[PDB]
Amino acid sequence: SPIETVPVKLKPGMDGPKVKQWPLTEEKIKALVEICTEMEKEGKISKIGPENPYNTPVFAIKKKDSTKWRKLVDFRELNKRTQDFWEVQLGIPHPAGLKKKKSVTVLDVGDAYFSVPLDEDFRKYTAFTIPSINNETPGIRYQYNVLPQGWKGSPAIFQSSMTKILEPFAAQNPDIVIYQYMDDLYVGSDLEIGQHRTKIEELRQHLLRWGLTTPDKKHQKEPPFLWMGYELHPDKWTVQPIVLPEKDSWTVNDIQKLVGKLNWASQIYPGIKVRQLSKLLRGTKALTEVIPLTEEAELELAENREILKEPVHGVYYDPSKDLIAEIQKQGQGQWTYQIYQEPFKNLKTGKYARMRGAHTNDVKQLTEAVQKITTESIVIWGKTPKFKLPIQKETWETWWTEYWQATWIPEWEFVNTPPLVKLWYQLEKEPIVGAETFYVDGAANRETKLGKAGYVTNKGRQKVVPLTNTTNQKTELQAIYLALQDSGLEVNIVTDSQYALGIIQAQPDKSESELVNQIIEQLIKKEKVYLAWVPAHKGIGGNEQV
Amino acid sequence: SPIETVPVKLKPGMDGPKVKQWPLTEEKIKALVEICTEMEKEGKISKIGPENPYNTPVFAIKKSTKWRKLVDFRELNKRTQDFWEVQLGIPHPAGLKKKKSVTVLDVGDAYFSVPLDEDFRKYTAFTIPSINNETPGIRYQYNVLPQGWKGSPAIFQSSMTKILEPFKKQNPDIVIYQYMDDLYVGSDLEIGQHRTKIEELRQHLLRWGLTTPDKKYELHPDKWTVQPIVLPEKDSWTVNDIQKLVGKLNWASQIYPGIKVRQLSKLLRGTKALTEVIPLTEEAELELAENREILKEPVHGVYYDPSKDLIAEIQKQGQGQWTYQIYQEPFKNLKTGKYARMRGAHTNDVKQLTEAVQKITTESIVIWGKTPKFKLPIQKETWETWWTEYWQATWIPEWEFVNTPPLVKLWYQ
Ligand SMILES: N#Cc1cc2c(Oc3ccc(F)cc3OCCn3ccc(=O)[nH]c3=O)cc(F)cn2c1
Questions:
Q1: Which of A21, A133, B8, B27 could form a cystine bridge with B120, CB 3.0-4.6 A?
Q2: Taking CB atoms and an 8 Å limit, are B246 and A534 in contact across chains?
Q3: 3-class DSSP state of B102
């Protein structure tokens, strides 16, 4: 009773569940009365009369070490009808954002949901009846007086209840820090180990006065602290040991589990790569299809095993020290970064891969990586870090001034660690005086898929190359690549395709299309390249064929 | 509680707003806590329990050197104002866009007096986030009329009219329009007499209990028009210059279908060098000059459709210059302009685009009485991080993020 209840309504225009259950044999009937009577004595449930109430199916089941039974009520139909609640904390705190405390204590509340009472005007909708053998003997009706196990609003109400119970204690003890997570409590403070144990005992007796049990036996947990797949040591943090299975045949389910452990291990283990293995999972069409491996995926997994071979740890946060982030390029559209305050100790690491689109240059990918780290830092530490980026200032200053989009990078200093990021070529802004002008064009038939690409120069030079199994877009890029092959170190190219121009003017560095890659190689080998555009069918100077 | 609360009812068949809370800086979280703690003592906002599943984002702007709290009521507006613009909507005068000077006055303090309908208070719920997901957050709800919600000026509308009635009688040539938190006051007077009459209204509202923090931002709507597309004019012309000219005039044919380019495209037969200077014929100069005056006259059949929404496209031009267009259907630009901020070590791209969006939104408020939806040339996650850094307005327009602006960059300057 001392815990003030939370008013719970049903969804507008709904009514409680009227499902009834007559199965489950007579063996588990008396096995459920053994639980219902002891729950009734503790005030968790109370028998309800034949007032024509609602009902809900209730099942029974044993477990390993069957000396402890288990009552399992299926509140599926009820949860569809109760109101919506404020969502419980979805994301767990990250260890790299936690601060160092001399002592840390863990307490898990037993019978947590059964220790918080339920709203009185709502208990009638949680009724259930234990079936008797149909010898015209009636069923014994019950209903919950506390938060039901598996009910929609149980976690959110218990969190609000627990937070209110901690208020009169955190007001008298502002020196200690109490974290809250589900049915657990993570107390920590810089107090001396003598008075810290007394503060923990005072808190336990406080929570017990509200009906919340706390492990008195021993102290429940020691400094290993296996929590949510983490290792929380008093002066360092790491993930729980990662195990990579070895198989001859790999299925889609196992590759999803493999990239899951790899992404989880990428928090602190620097250099984890998952581009090739995720390229295998690009095929969404399967559940357990045996997907064959690739040579790049086997090598990338072998590199990940070599990194996981040597354990590396991370440290906690010190607000008095600055927050620094450093990025390096891996060379496959992948990037890696480390967030740290000390040279040899990392708070956490991470990677960023550009799986969106097919054409992008390194300066754009570096910016998007800084964006991902900026968001992650505001989440974990609440501030933005200082960036050490392997890029010259004149490089980035030239890119954002030319880029059509709006970008912003905070205070950053140049770290001279190759491979550096730099634009490999810049197109000429004005036409080149004394350079041969190529009038390129490419066409294709979409049914036959047999096109052609060529050019006509101002010097009277013409050429037409046939293409098989191509499209209009491929031929237009093929026609520009053809001009770069048959021209000097300075060339003017004139095309009628808005497509091929937008790909070139983006100035990309790499791509999956080997055609675009060889176009990039030609643009680097040239000295000056000016690419202009004209409408497709205005007959200004373009010569095309159908 | 002067009078019973105005019953607020959402449109039938629609639930309240459940929007996520973007992570905030430790500096900004501490500011919101100080503000909300003071607002809690003054009965404005109150903490709520877990039975309140709705949420509304909350940010911290700089108003000044002190922190100001800004609520993103965009979702609650579309869930209440779309039914409340019909019931208690505020009419938009079409003469405000014709005055010589329009000053904006912040009157958002008036709503803190009026109570909010108790049944509707659960939809104004907002959450102060916690760093690194340590605490579940601080959840408040509003008990008074909240700023940024379009229902507060609609409720306070009758109260605002009574206060402004004596001033309107003394000045029958002054237009006063209210949009959410701002009082747009336009007149044709001299700049000196305008600011004097503005100060009189400030002193008039202040002596009726309406405080306006403006103790030291004026506009001029008679200069807002669809800017004409200018064609480059050089002493000589080359093959490349005529190519950029015909390509631009062909793009303009989608807007002015009375443009011919056959004589400009005949001046170059073909297979010529780009840097080859080519003089223009008489018919080429005739076709050029004919396509110049037809491009310096507004379009035919371009009207504002109140049923359709407004769309604003912005594109980066470099050197601190930004151009924009406001339309409802493609190539039917109702208004175009060019925003330009002073370059130097005091500006960057995101700051310029932010101030440009606020300038465009203010123009759209004066001209049409509603804000447009922005197609922003910026990365989504990037803009959602730093947009509150340079945001001074009290409202938030709708926006989406584009990724493929074509060769239009040169065609709009
Ligand atoms: N199981 C589990 C469990 C315990 C905790 C948790 O405990 C803390 C509470 C307050 C605090 F200020 C620091 C804390 O932990 C930092 C790591 N640490 C550990 C041991 C030690 O001796 N010193 C030390 O610094 C915080 C959290 F977010 C999740 N948790 C899960």
A1: B8
A2: yes
A3: strand
